[PDB]
Amino acid sequence: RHTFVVADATLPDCPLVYASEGFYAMTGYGPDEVLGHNCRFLQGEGTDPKEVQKIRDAIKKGEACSVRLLNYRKDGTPFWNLLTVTPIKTPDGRVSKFVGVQVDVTS
Ligand SMILES: *[C@@]12=NC3=[C]C([C])=C([C])[C]=C3N([C][C]([O])[C]([O])[C]([O])[C]OP([O])([O])=O)C1=NC(=O)[N]C2=O
């Protein structure tokens, strides 16, 4: 059971351009609130800054990354999000998109 998003890396702050139905249903946010925005709006007080930094660095370097994140739904309730980000390059080496699989691992 997982969800999927696509971020545009040709815009400087990796906005989300596509989300699976599960992503909206899991987070409680609609397309009007999700599309065109950076995924970080799902972070909040308890989100570990040291893991957040791991994703920031991997995205800046165009590498894949996998981190465990405390995230929050629109109603404020938290959940554990095993997040894996994969860079999608054009044949000329440049990163065009990032894709993400998000798993609620609260169990
Ligand atoms: C988010 N999923 C997610 C999916 C993709 C494809 C990408 C590129 C990023 C995310 N993020 C995080 C956010 O966009 C950003 O990369 C990090 O917050 C670190 O950068 P900053 O500048 O903020 O330090 C996701 N973040 C979440 O919290 N939940 C996800 O599902």
Swiss-Prot record:
Domain PAS: 1-62
Positions annotated to bind FMN: 38-43, 56, 71, 81, 102
Subcellular location field: Membrane
Effect after changing residue 39 to A: No effect on blue light-induced kinase activity
PTM annotation, UniProt: Autophosphorylated in response to blue light irradiation. 2 molecules of FMN bind covalently to cysteines after exposure to blue light and are reversed in the dark.
S-4a-FMN cysteine sites (modified residues): 39
Stretches of the chain forming a coiled coil according to its record: none
Residue span, PAC domain: 63-107
Domain of life according to the entry: Eukaryota
Tissues where the protein occurs: Expressed in gametes, pre-gametes and gametes generated by pre-gametes (at protein level).
Transmembrane segments: none
Stated family: Belongs to the protein kinase superfamily. AGC Ser/Thr protein kinase family.
Summary of the function given for this chain in its UniProt record: Protein kinase that acts as a blue light photoreceptor. Required for non-photochemical quenching (NPQ), a mechanism that converts and dissipates the harmful excess absorbed light energy into heat and protect the photosynthetic apparatus from photo-oxidative damage. Controls the energy-dependent chlorophyll fluorescence quenching (qE) activity of chlorophyll excited states by inducing the expression of the qE effector protein LHCSR3 in high light intensities.
Protein name in the entry: Phototropin
The species this protein was found in: Chlamydomonas reinhardtii (Chlamydomonas smithii)
Lineage: Eukaryota, Viridiplantae, Chlorophyta, core chlorophytes, Chlorophyceae
Originating gene: PHOT
